[PDB]
């Protein structure tokens with residue numbers, strides 16, 4: 001009986017507030033930093049077109065076994081062929097059309113399978129595809145793809161993830177002499193509990209497809225989550241550094257909540273932004289075939 005965590009804040013900025021992402025995130029910060037994650041719905045007219053080279057988009061997804069940690073004790077696809085596989089998997093698993101499966105049912109079934117010792121569900125995830133390989137999901141004035149006059153406002157938009165500031169201030173940067181990543185998801189494909197490198201911000205955009213479910217923990221409960229992890233994670237991974245342990249830190253949010261860790265959830269739909277604040281532990285899974293883009297900013 002999985003209990004859905006409370007909903008994270010959702011913001012619907014007007015066209016005035018939507019003029020600058022960094023200004024908007026700083027003003028919603030007093031609330032969103034207390035929940036770890038937040039969702040931002042752009043104005044209804046803001047619809048960036050999909051600019052990925054779909055004709056050339058090929059990738060080999062990684063294999064995910066949902067119950068790999070509880071059990072302790074691949075084809076190359078195009079975007080079309082992966083989606084046909086993703087839709088056939090979900091429609092066969094739930095025995096109904098893909099768009100008719102309630103998001104609460106996929107959520108309850110995902111967490112049952114993760115801890116299931118009898119059912120071994122295996123899915124695939126097109127994870128960590130660089131935007132340099134086939135182009136960003138957003139229009140970019142890089143001269144390698146045709147940008148129409150109606151699309152130029154999106155190539156120059158501050159909410160275009162390619163236009164987010166990524167350079168961190170340091171003395172090393174002045175003594176010296178990032179790009180968004182793409183995620184093609186299917187039903188039950190997931191990412192486990194982790195924080196971004198250098199406790200960085202991260203913004204995620206779902207270009208199209210089925211929703212992506214998120215779980216977020218505010219930064220003021222980061223040490224409590226890490227303590228709960230060490231107490232409940234397998235002992236063979238107890239001594240591993242964070243950069244490696246984060247690869248195998250899948251945990252039911254109700255287990256964290258039972259130990260007093262505040263967890264917030266949300267369903268990121270197509271065309272919606274999710275922002276993760278510094279040192280906000282987050283995890284989640286995809287409701288079905290979708291396409292997401294994410295970048296770290298500061």
Ligand SMILES: C=CC(=O)N1CCCN(c2cc(NCCC(=O)O)nc(-c3ccccn3)n2)CC1
Pocket residue numbers: 125127128183190191192193194195196197204212246247292293294
């Ligand atoms: C956390 C490890 C993890 O579960 N995986 C599998 C899932 C895909 N992938 C991801 C995904 C992700 N965010 C989800 C975005 C989305 O899927 O839309 N963040 C990272 C990451 C890794 C190191 C440092 C910072 N971030 N890696 C690779 C490792």
Ligand SMILES: [Mn+2]
Pocket residue numbers: 194195196
């Ligand atoms: Mn990440």
